[PDB]
């Protein structure tokens, strides 16, 4: 409703000047004493000056979509953004048949997990059975963690580096940060034989270094052996976790670098890098599409539930003191993850603002939110997200993507400015401006040469 002018000299310079500015494309619209600045003003002011509605140039934002197997549609959208004016389009999510599942079992091997280890060693077949009950063609893997091997996270006395467990126990291995035990496989006997070799361990302080191991799992996809399917990372523990900052107690001041450091399937350089931050891990997990399942004991449940705020595609289930219920935990967690659908976008320049409206099938609706969010999403029951994109400037050609978190399918959004009036054909008006200059938008932009105004 408002048009501050500065030095408009053509139609594009008019539209760029403000969201409420419009341009009149009529011939001989200007009086001699008046400049061509007067062709730019608000719509009512231009109508007051006699411009017909069909000669008022007012570009408006626009969304065009190319659709082309129905989980995320459309796949390509083109946006023409008039500054200050939002363009809207709906993304339809149709939850498809579940993909195969790669489950990497990342287990805490502190001493209180001794009875847990005796059970997990015999659950290779139960885990693959469960994966092939949810979908088909499942694979399982295994890793273990304790903590960084420096004071005060472990006791560095040589007797206790040899036996971190209580002195009576002697099927105990030295402390270690992360060990990759089993590459993802459908062979339950490899699980039984390789996990069977693992001995219980120990450490000094209550929090542990499982976030280190999770970072290595996410940073080493070739060693872990992920397929391009559903990637579940079970994190089984009975304790809290260290994170960035805690390394200072052991004089570790270098941040986690987010790189793969597996040598001989061991995080050997773990005493060189501090623990990751939670956000850093949430970022690494979303990059590689790895969805963590925090299988923690009762007293840790509420602590690990707060992680689901930072890691959108994660879930928490209460693990037994001997881990004997872990299979139902995984089943419940898969339903928790798959019934929740987030629609989000990658990083944007400060010139674009994206908001989401969620039209969920479970009767819930959210409008104008920073992220699409629906719960209770059921197979083959479509939900809709209305995406609104607004630009503050006349932007340069640009693109970003929109994902349903937890899947690799994207909506590629091509973003173009709309600072150009698409004006009338100069046909029927040829003989032009009594000169060689050509017309654009009812205002003569004369070929250079003498120039001026009427030409």
């Amino acid at each position: 409703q408002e048009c501050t002018k500065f030095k408009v000299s053509s139609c594009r310079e008019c539209i760029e000047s403000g969201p409420g500015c419009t341009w009149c494309q009529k011939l001989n619209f200007t009086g001699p004493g008046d400049p061509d600045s007067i062709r730019c003003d608000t719509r009512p002011q231009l109508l007051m000056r006699g411009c017909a509605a069909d000669d008022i140039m007012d570009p408006t934002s626009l969304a065009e979509t190319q659709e082309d197997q129905k989980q995320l549609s459309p796949q390509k959208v083109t946006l023409y953004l008039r500054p200050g004016q939002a363009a809207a389009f709906n993304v339809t999510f149709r939850r498809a048949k579940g993909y195969p599942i790669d489950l990497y079992y990342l287990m805490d091997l502190s001493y209180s997990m001794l009875d847990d280890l005796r059970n997990v060693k015999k659950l290779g077949g139960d885990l693959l059975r469960a994966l092939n009950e949810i979908t088909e063609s499942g694979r399982i893997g295994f890793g273990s963690f304790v903590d960084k091997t420096v004071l005060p996270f472990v006791n560095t006395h040589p007797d206790k580096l040899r036996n971190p467990c209580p002195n009576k126990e002697k099927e105990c291995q030295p402390p270690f940060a992360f060990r990759h035990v089993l590459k993802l496989t459908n062979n339950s006997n490899q699980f039984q034989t390789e996990v069977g070799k693992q001995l219980i361990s120990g450490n000094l302080d209550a929090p542990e270094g499982g976030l280190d191991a999770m970072m290595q799992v996410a940073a080493c996809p070739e060693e872990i052996g992920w397929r391009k399917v559903t990637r579940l990372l079970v994190f089984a523990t009975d304790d809290g976790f260290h994170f960035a900052g805690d390394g200072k107690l052991g004089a570790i001041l270098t941040p986690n670098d987010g790189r793969c450091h597996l040598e001989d399937n061991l995080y050997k350089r773990s005493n060189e890098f501090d623990y990751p931050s939670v956000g850093q891990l949430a970022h690494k997990l979303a990059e590689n599409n790895i969805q963590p399942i925090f299988a923690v004991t009762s007293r840790m449940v509420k602590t690990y539930e707060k992680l689901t705020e930072i890691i959108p595609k994660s879930a928490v289930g209460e693990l037994s003191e001997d881990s004997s219920n872990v299979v139902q935990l995984i089943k419940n967690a898969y339903n928790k993850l798959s019934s929740r659908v987030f629609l989000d976008h990658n990083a944007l320049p400060d010139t674009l603002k994206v908001t989401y409206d969620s039209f969920c099938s479970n009767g819930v609706t959210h409008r104008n939110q920073p992220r699409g969010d629906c719960d209770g999403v059921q197979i083959n029951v479509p939900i809709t997200f209305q995406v609104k994109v607004t630009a503050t400037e006349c932007i340069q050609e640009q693109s970003f993507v929109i994902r349903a978190l937890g899947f690799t399918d994207i909506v590629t959004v091509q973003v173009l400015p709309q600072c150009e009036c698409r004006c009338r054909d100069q046909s029927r008006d040829r003989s032009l401006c009594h000169g060689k200059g050509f017309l654009e938008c009812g205002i003569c932009r004369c070929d250079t040469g003498y120039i001026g105004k009427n030409c």
Binding site: G240, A244, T254, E309, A347
Partner: protein, 579 residues
């Protein structure tokens, strides 16, 4: 807004490790740089001079010991220029256990001058086998009923410690000394009543020096039943000051408790005369009892106080420190199973007072209280101490403590809880006195790992109201670095733009190559928006972690312009405020 980036100067020794620049401090006579060692390397403190442009490592004259931690903890007192530096890496083993605490250094003049040192929150090693000697007063001053209660005390201590690895001996001292029973005598019977049956009150003087020496040379003997692999412990019971003089160097290897009883230890001047006989610190090894009847109360301290649970063995003292108006405090994050706390330090560094959470609950454990400790001083209102527990409940919180008032004690006056797991709320603190009126009215709390809304890290401004600190605002850094760690370093900068109001710098070392934000002081608080953002890229092409440390209280060369030192990876940088 007037910091001259185009004139920034770089300081870096040719063998600087990556953690040179972990701490920077402008002191009277230059800039100090803490450089913790990486890997196997030990740490060090560097002296950097603006006129020279070079950084030279400092040699400590009385330090038997230097770990990789040295350089991690640096504080200076604005009132007198003192320097506090701590080495929280004093590692040691006790049987199969390993202990870890700190070693702190106090420089009254500068790093080159006289130095005091101490070991705050240091728990001595006491093995499974303990040979303990009772050295009890039998002087002319004791009534028969008082002498008996000293003897009853020794019997009750042996009664409680029967069926342990403890072996006992006892020596009466007055003018002379007599072993009432040896370690082998205790092995033969294990009967306190029978071992002390023949004791007769000497009723003479009080020669404590000679007595302690007699214990070290005549009592701790293998042929008398002493075990060479046991910890030697000495419990001294006296009702008056020593009537001799000298030294107890012969007994230095012995862990020494002393118990001062009764009217002759009424003045604290006489109580301090017992410190030279006991181990350190006096707050642990010197017990002052106003009456002999309180000896029965003592069995809790001198029996229960003499691993799945940890008290101060892994205190990690010196991991943080502050120094203001001659008063030093060091954090102790490992205290009480990493519940944490801090250590009120006597200013010769030979005694300390621990303060932690109360009550000790399961929830405060693994909270790392004392990860930051920051004095919030005032001249009219009460002076406070803010300490962060950035791991409390995996979220972090800040406790506010009030200095002892009058005769009373340290008091906890407020708790401020963080809301996001992993945010390390309370991992960085800073008090600000904007108008420089002597009242610290602002506490800034950094949450450098805070996640969300496309910017990493937060700094919250709290202002002191009548009932406590109220959250007034936030220091707003740029979006675009979700992991940038805005708030890893926060410091008050004095006045850099000449309007009389203190300004604040916030470092964001992981915003690309690092950055520092300047927030100017205004009337009523701090501006939430920054007036300047210095990109590390612009200072050095290949720099990293720019803004990991900041200190700008000083004008290093006396040209009328404020100076701000900034730490980075292997670098220290000086920026000058220019009109």
């Amino acid at each position: 807004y007037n910091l001259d980036v185009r004139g920034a100067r770089s300081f870096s020794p040719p063998r600087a490790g990556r953690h040179f620049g972990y701490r920077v401090l402008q002191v009277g006579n230059g800039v100090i740089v803490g450089a913790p060692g990486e890997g196997n390397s030990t740490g060090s403190l560097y002296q950097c001079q603006s006129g020279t442009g070079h950084c030279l490592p400092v040699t400590l004259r009385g330090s038997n010991y230097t770990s990789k931690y040295l350089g991690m903890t640096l504080a200076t007192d604005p009132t007198d220029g003192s320097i506090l530096a701590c080495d929280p890496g004093l590692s040691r083993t006790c049987d199969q256990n390993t202990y870890l605490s700190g070693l702190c250094y106090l420089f009254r003049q500068n790093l080159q001058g006289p130095m005091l040192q101490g070991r705050p929150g240091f728990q001595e090693c006491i093995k499974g086998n303990v040979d303990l000697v009772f050295l009890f007063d039998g002087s002319m001053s004791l009534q028969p009923d008082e002498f008996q209660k000293i003897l009853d005390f020794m019997k009750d201590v042996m009664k409680k410690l029967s069926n342990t690895s403890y072996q006992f001996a006892a020596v009466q001292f007055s003018t002379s000394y007599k072993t009432e029973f040896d370690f082998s005598d205790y092995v033969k019977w294990k009967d306190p009543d029978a071992l002390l049956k023949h004791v007769k009150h000497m009723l003479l003087l009080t020669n404590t020096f000679g007595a302690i020496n007699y214990v070290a040379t005549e009592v701790f003997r293998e042929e008398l039943g002493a075990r060479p692999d046991a910890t030697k412990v000495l419990i001294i019971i006296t009702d008056g000051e020593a009537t001799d003089s000298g030294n107890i160097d012969a007994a230095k290897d012995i862990i020494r408790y002393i118990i001062g009883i009764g009217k002759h230890f009424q003045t604290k001047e006489s109580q301090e005369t017992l410190h030279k006989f006991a181990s350190k610190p006096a707050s642990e090894f010197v017990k002052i009892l106003d009456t002999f009847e309180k000896l029965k109360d003592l069995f809790t301290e001198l029996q229960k106080k003499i691993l799945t649970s940890f008290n101060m063995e892994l205190s990690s003292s010196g991991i943080s420190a502050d120094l203001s108006r001659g008063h030093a405090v060091v954090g102790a994050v490992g205290a009480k199973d990493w519940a944490g706390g801090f250590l009120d330090l006597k200013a010769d560094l030979q005694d300390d007072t621990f303060i932690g959470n109360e009550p000790l609950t399961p929830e405060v454990r693994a909270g790392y209280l004392g990860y930051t400790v920051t004095w919030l001083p005032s001249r009219q209102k009460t002076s406070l101490l803010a300490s962060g527990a950035p791991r409390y409940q995996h979220m972090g919180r800040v406790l506010l403590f009030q200095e002892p008032q009058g005769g009373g004690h340290w008091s906890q006056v407020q708790t401020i809880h963080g809301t996001q797991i992993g945010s390390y709320f309370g991992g960085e603190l800073c008090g600000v006195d904007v108008d420089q009126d002597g009242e610290t009215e602002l506490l800034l709390i950094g949450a450098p790992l805070f996640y969300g809304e496309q910017r990493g890290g937060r700094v919250f401004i709290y202002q002191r109201r009548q009932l406590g600190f109220e959250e007034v605002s936030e220091l707003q850094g740029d979006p675009g670095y979700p992991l940038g760690r805005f708030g890893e370093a926060i410091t008050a900068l004095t006045d850099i733009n000449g309007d009389g109001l203190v300004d604040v710098a916030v470092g964001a070392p992981l915003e690309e190559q690092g950055a520092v934000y300047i927030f100017n002081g205004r009337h009523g608080g701090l501006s939430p928006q920054p007036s300047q953002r210095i990109e590390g890229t612009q200072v050095l092409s290949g720099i990293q972690w720019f803004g990991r440390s900041i200190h700008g209280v000083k004008d290093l060369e006396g040209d009328g312009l404020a100076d701000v030192a900034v730490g980075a990876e292997s670098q220290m940088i000086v920026l000058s405020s220019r009109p």
